[model samples]
Target chain A: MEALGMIETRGLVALIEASDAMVKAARVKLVGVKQIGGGLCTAMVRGDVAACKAATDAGAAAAQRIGELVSVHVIPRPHGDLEEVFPIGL
Target chain B: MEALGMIETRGLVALIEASDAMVKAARVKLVGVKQIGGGLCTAMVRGDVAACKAATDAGAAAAQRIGELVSVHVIPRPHGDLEEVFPIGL
Candidate 1:
């Protein structure tokens, strides 16, 4: 299963920057953007375990450089149930 | 014209905490919530200039404790144009 990577940021501008870095840092796909209230948003992507992990770190670092970083995580292998639990794409 | 206070946070939990502090710190009315993607959201309040200033500070402090703080602002007097520019209520 492809690993899932997520990075939460406080500004969309930073999210954009983070997304740019993630794709460049690894062979990951920008799968979705999740917008939640409180000036909070998320960047979602998927790739190999190491790739996603690397991507999450890169994106999180980029986000911290320009804006607020809420959280950054990598699910080594997301449960198939997640496909039904969350929206998968932008 | 009423003063407007805004506090941006990375988590909704922090936003809620910030709102609670804002209203309690000053005699401000919660006018609305602004939600934008990237895990960022905002709390909007209106009151007297000094009241709004105090409210914003209190809210920012609360947000910093629990979540990422993006920005905190006090529009001593928001222009009439702002009423049209922003969504004023949740």
Candidate 2:
């Protein structure tokens, strides 16, 4: 399983900016964009563990500067069911 | 563009309750269920503006009683691009 990064934010502009930063910060693929209503959104990315970690850090920093960041994490190994249960896959 | 209602909550249970309450409260269609991570989620519904407004109110109230509600709103007319960019479709 590949590493995955997720960044949750309270606004669209900030989330978009964060996603841009994440892809630019490392060799990663932007896998998904999700909105959970009330202006909440998430940017999901995938790469090697190191790249995922770096990308999420860059993304969180960028998002926090522009808007409210709810949470951010890089999963070194995600559960296989995540792909089927959530929109976390390509 | 049709009127849309969205309710954001902190738990899956509350969101389900809110969605159920919304559809039961007004003549609206449950359009989508979205999760933005860190336990945040959203329920989207579509109907006339008045119906959407009423549904959102019912949804928000029900969600708040069961769990933490982030926000709720009714858009009388959504932008055309919103449907294409976001997962608010039926």
Candidate 3:
């Protein structure tokens, strides 16, 4: 089953760092990015549950190294309705 | 002269809290919001240098209470060119 992995950071610069770390460390696809405000940015990825967890872990650490790292989470079986609710941009 | 104040936070939830704290506490106007990604968001304000500083301090503290507060900064005299360079969504 697929999972949705997320990493939230505080600054703009750190997201790219987190994004690179996530895709490189695990077999996952970057699916979406959300900027919730106050410098909060969240990146989402999709893949096998195992890969998503690995990517989330890798991405969170990378973001922490550069800026304010917020939170990391993985939805092992996110509702399909989410894809339409959120912007899944490249 | 107007100054620019900024507060960066880690999650989507914190920015609104920060924004409210800032505007309510000082004579400042919210000018822009930037979502840089990893779940990083930034809120910009315009005001007198003293009021801007006051707003940043209040906003940062409020954001810290709810999420990963990244950094707070004040540009007492930002270059006029900045308005054209970055998104200034009021």
Best by lDDT: 2
Q: Which portions of model 2 miss their true places by more than 4 Å?
A: A1-8, A11-90
lDDT of 1 at B16: 98
Clashing pairs in 2: none
Order of quality (DockQ): 1, 3, 2
* lDDT head-to-head 1 vs 3, winner: 1
The lDDT of each candidate is: 0.78, 0.80, 0.76
Instruction: Give the per-residue lDDT digits (tens) of candidate 2, residues A1-90.
Output: 889999988855456557767877888877877776666688788899999999999889987875679999989999999999887787
All candidates: TM-score: 0.52, 0.55, 0.52
Q: State the lDDT at A29 in candidate 3.
A: 77
lDDT tens readout by residue for model 1, B44-88 = 888999999999999999999998887787767444434532444
TM-score of chain A considered alone, across all candidate predictions? 0.94, 0.96, 0.89
> In candidate 3, what are the lDDT values of residues B1-90, reduced to their tens digit?
588788777676898899999999899999887776556677888899999999989999999898888767776765443454344324
Q: Which stretches of candidate 3 lie over 4 Å from their true place?
A: A1-90
Which has the greatest TM-score? 2
Best candidate, DockQ-wise?
1
Query: Can you give the lDDT of residue B11 in candidate 1?
Result: 76
